[PDB]
Scaffold this active site. Structure first.
Site, PDB file in Angstrom:
ATOM      1  N   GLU A  24      -9.768  -5.757  -3.946  1.00  0.00           N
ATOM      2  CA  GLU A  24      -9.185  -4.702  -3.116  1.00  0.00           C
ATOM      3  C   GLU A  24     -10.188  -3.771  -2.434  1.00  0.00           C
ATOM      4  OE1 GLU A  24      -6.245  -4.655  -5.525  1.00  0.00           O
ATOM      5  OE2 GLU A  24      -4.674  -4.756  -3.971  1.00  0.00           O
ATOM      6  N   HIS A  57      -7.867  -5.644   0.078  1.00  0.00           N
ATOM      7  CA  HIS A  57      -6.653  -4.860   0.275  1.00  0.00           C
ATOM      8  C   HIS A  57      -6.183  -5.179   1.659  1.00  0.00           C
ATOM      9  CE1 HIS A  57      -3.936  -1.395   0.133  1.00  0.00           C
ATOM     10  NE2 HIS A  57      -4.410  -0.998   1.323  1.00  0.00           N
ATOM     11  N   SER A  67       0.815  -1.205   0.000  1.00  0.00           N
ATOM     12  CA  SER A  67       0.000   0.000   0.000  1.00  0.00           C
ATOM     13  C   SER A  67       0.851   1.258   0.000  1.00  0.00           C
ATOM     14  CB  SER A  67      -0.987  -0.004   1.171  1.00  0.00           C
ATOM     15  OG  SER A  67      -2.015   0.940   0.933  1.00  0.00           O
TER      16      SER A  67
END
Lengths: 569, 569
Positions: free
Chosen positions: A350, A470, A217
């Site tokens: 995600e 995610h 990320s």
């Protein structure tokens, strides 16, 4: 607006307590000293729940504590100690709001790196893996209860977990050149950590000519910035970008007028000039500034999809320690890191990350009736009402809206492309069409399990929520306090060996492929070519399989937006 | 002579690489154009590790490239040019044996100067500082990786660094007046550059009426020579002699016979004849001449402590460009430079420089049995065995041999005096008995640090050595590639400020004192007066104190050799 069940908070608290006892039972009476350029450090042999062992060095300082006069400034060299520094315990994290308790935690004294290896004197110098943690440049740490090296130490690598400054203390930017607050101090933290690693990893049995930086990320955007900036030139040799890169919308922002705004929320009380705003912010309590970051963004900025008030930025004037002198897109065109082996990837769902946020705030799916708020700023007008911008929202609506009314699923599928897939596509093409870059390996994490989790599942209230969100992949890279000993033959356990094995293989050779990784026999993993019309990637499920990216069709739909404005792609 | 280890040479190599990219990081997109009597010159704004900026002009020719027929000859005016000449990079250094790699580098094309200032358009006409590098007249340059202006450009001054011809290419001397190779070509370059400076410094915001020439060591002897020569009468207004002067015994040499000797080592061929020896050396390869100049000096000569085969010399006949028509000490009596403010100084352990040489050659310390070889040539007999010179050598020995047998440290103490302190005494006194010259301000550099160094420490294998060597003070005037940013509070940064401030203070007014300078409260710094029996100096360590010269006692023991020859002192 992340909220956590009061029971889940109680359950997390009792886990923090239980983790203190486990941590003790895995600590050994075996300590050991390593040399560093600033002096001697003392580490400790630790065990895993799998009964592996490794040597732990935590809280090694790579910079001076950035306090008093050093607040908001570039990090400076730490000062050498005589004797022997005790590194048998972690130090504190960067000042931040705790993602579970919602309390302010941490300390301004946070510039530390941790080093882990199973053998402090190996017969060969080992691959070095550097992890940069995510958390939106606003949360995260290198504490072993979140990022335990337990899995990686089964492998013959040195693993290093860095901290860096977060929030306004990491990323405050002011236009006045007199002030020496250009922005990106947390990024310059990372550069200095990376520099320390190059100069010291051999003292821990690591090969300085074989360094891999990965992150997830914001940690992946960080990795990419570390591959873009001229500061870090030739310092590492492989890069892995996990669910993120530097041209993701959330990864940067022009935050130069947000500092007067933060001062105001804290009780300023003065004029909008950089000098007096900084004077005041330099006296403010750290925890209080951090408390008030969440209110800094105006509704208009939030609506325009600006994720964070403070983050990486184009620096308004040049300095010696300047990390980002131009737009990331422009820096890609000239990036040293284009020349190193690169692996990128995303999870298979995600946007599922936003599941409980959409429950809290259901009036968000209405933003899909017209997809005007998700049109890239390059194309969208100021008021976002021009027909050209509605025409383009319509292109996105077509890609994601499944029926006559937009849903939660459509919104979460749209976010997967908005925050991840589309930026990665754009980076891949821009990388081909303006640089001679070494082709990229792509993966897709599509392994779902509710049996082994990480603490991000708690933060988003995603317990029992089927699908690969995610953040879900970190469970199979790092031990954490919510993890448990898994049977050697179970699904989750084999994914650990695969992920850790593939990353290790990629860190070793520049190629993620190995026939010694169970499940990867008969796998033909090709890097992406300028010629490719549809990307192929290793889909990581119960089986490893080379499919072509299923998101491709929709990625192509997002690309059509740029039909008339083909140069901004 | 000086040898560098493989480990240190490898580290130097990589340091050069890194410095190149740091140079790019420190480079702005701001270019500027300035006027010269020869044409317009393009320069660049460059940053500093402390984030100061300065305008940089490198490679400004002040003379014709001394190639082809111009070899060994006095320098000729450069050719004017139309348009903008590019001065954004350094030119070549003078053909040279690299003091670390041991390889011949540099070029015949070396007659350039660099100009640096933080402002092309200042509010005042600034003091112009003109640094002449040292290097025994055989090594040195104006590259910013050795002599970086980064510290001085903190001050409101114009800083200029010159190059001049080194070794045999700058200091060949031949008796025959037809051949026009009288000697002192390199010093003639210095005159040339000074004239360029008088005439051109106002174009860069300098005051033609306020110019200081300063040099370390052979640059100190160079500075003195410029204060002594009629060629330069009037040109500048202050002079600072740092660790050396023109009456130092290494600072000049009658080298006229040695052109044959060099020519022989290179292949020649014919007879000891100024015309033919010259024809050969003219066709000869410059790199071959420089490599072999190491072998020119006989055993005889270097026993008598002739240190360099080619150097400043008393020119045998008069020319229009003659710098040195007489012996330096006779020229002192006539010198225009006696009427300008002068600062002189030395470090507190100059001889500690020869430390690795003594480790390499322990037999050298036996010269201290009698000390006959250190007796001023004025006073000693030819073969150095006469009763009178054994007695004079006995007076040197009593001054320096502490125990009963001579050690390495007694050798280095002696060297401090033979090469530096005694000639300095002799110069002050000569200026008193025979001139009404200005009272000289004296300083003593006595600040030791291993945290900040310059390349000469590499050259002299001085990495581990405690004490303040000849060359150690330059670390606090010039940036170099081995340097790093220091913290404002650090003892090194404060020295940099002081050294640079004092030099800038003396350059401005001619009095080195200022209460603006952090360590200079309560310092009454008087210059040396005729009546003073014991010298007084500003001692520079962690504190700045007026003391009497600790070396005074041994100086007067050196003077006692002239008891029966007062006329020669």
């Amino acid at each position: 607006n992340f909220n956590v069940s009061l029971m889940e908070k109680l359950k997390w608290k009792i886990k923090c307590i239980e983790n203190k006892f486990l941590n003790y039972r895995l600590t050994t009476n075996e300590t050991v000293v390593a040399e560093t350029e600033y002096g001697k450090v003392k580490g400790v042999k630790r065990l895993t729940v799998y009964d592996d062992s490794y040597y732990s060095f935590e809280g090694i300082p790579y910079a001076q504590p950035p306090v008093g006069e050093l607040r908001f400034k570039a990090p400076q060299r730490p000062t050498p100690w005589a004797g022997v520094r005790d590194c048998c315990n972690h130090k504190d994290k960067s000042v931040q709001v705790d993602f579970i308790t919602g309390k302010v935690c941490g300390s301004e004294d946070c510039l530390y790196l941790s080093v882990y290896t199973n053998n402090l004197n190996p017969e060969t110098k080992r691959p070095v893996l550097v992890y940069i943690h995510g958390g939106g440049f606003i949360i995260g740490e290198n504490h072993r209860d979140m990022y335990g090296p337990d899995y990686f130490i089964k492998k013959d690598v040195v693993l290093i977990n860095i901290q860096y400054r977060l929030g306004a203390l990491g990323f405050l930017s002011l236009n006045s050149e007199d002030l020496n607050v250009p922005g990106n101090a947390g990024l310059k933290d990372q550069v200095m950590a990376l520099r320390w690693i190059k100069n010291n990893c051999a003292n821990f049995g690591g090969n300085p000519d074989n360094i891999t930086v990965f992150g997830e990320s914001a940690g992946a955007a960080s990795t990419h910035y570390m591959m873009l900036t001229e500061q870090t030139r030739g310092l590492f040799h492989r890069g892995i970008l996990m669910s993120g890169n530097a041209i993701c919308p959330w990864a940067n922002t022009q935050c130069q007028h947000r500092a007067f705004t933060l001062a105001k929320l804290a009780g300023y009380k003065g004029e909008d000039n950089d000098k007096d705003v900084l004077e005041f912010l330099m006296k403010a309590k750290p925890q209080d500034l951090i408390k008030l970051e969440e209110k800094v963004l105006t509704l208009e900025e939030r609506t325009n999809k600006v994720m964070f008030p403070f983050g990486p930025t184009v620096e308004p004037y040049q300095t010696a320690d300047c990390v980002l002198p131009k737009h990331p897109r422009e820096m890609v065109k000239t990036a040293w890191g284009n020349s190193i082996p690169t692996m990128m990837g995303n999870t298979s769902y995600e946007g599922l990350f936003f599941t409980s946020i959409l429950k809290q705030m259901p009036l968000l799916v209405k933003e899909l009736e017209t997809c005007v708020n998700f049109v890239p700023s390059e194309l969208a007008d100021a008021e976002r009402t021009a027909p050209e911008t509605l025409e383009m929202g319509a292109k996105i609506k077509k890609a994601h809206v499944t029926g006559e009314t937009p849903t939660a699923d459509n919104f979460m599928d749209l976010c997967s492309h908005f925050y991840f897939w589309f930026p990665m596509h754009r980076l891949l093409q821009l990388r081909f069409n303006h640089t001679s870059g070494t082709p990229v390996y792509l993966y897709r994490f599509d392994f779902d399990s509710e049996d082994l989790i990480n603490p991000y599942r708690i933060m988003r209230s995603g317990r029992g929520v089927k699908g690969v969100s995610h953040t879900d992949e970190l469970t199979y890279f790092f031990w954490n306090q919510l993890a448990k000993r898994m049977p050697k033959e179970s699904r989750e356990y084999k994914t650990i060996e695969r992920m850790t094995g593939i990353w290790t293989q990629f860190a070793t050779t520049g190629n993620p492929y190995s026939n010694e990784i169970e499940g990867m026999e008969n796998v033909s993993w090709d890097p992406i070519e300028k010629s490719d019309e549809v990307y192929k990637c290793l889909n990581i499920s119960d089986e490893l399989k080379m499919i072509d990216v299923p998101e491709m069709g929709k990625i192509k739909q997002w690309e059509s937006m740029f039909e008339k404005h083909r140069d901004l792609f």
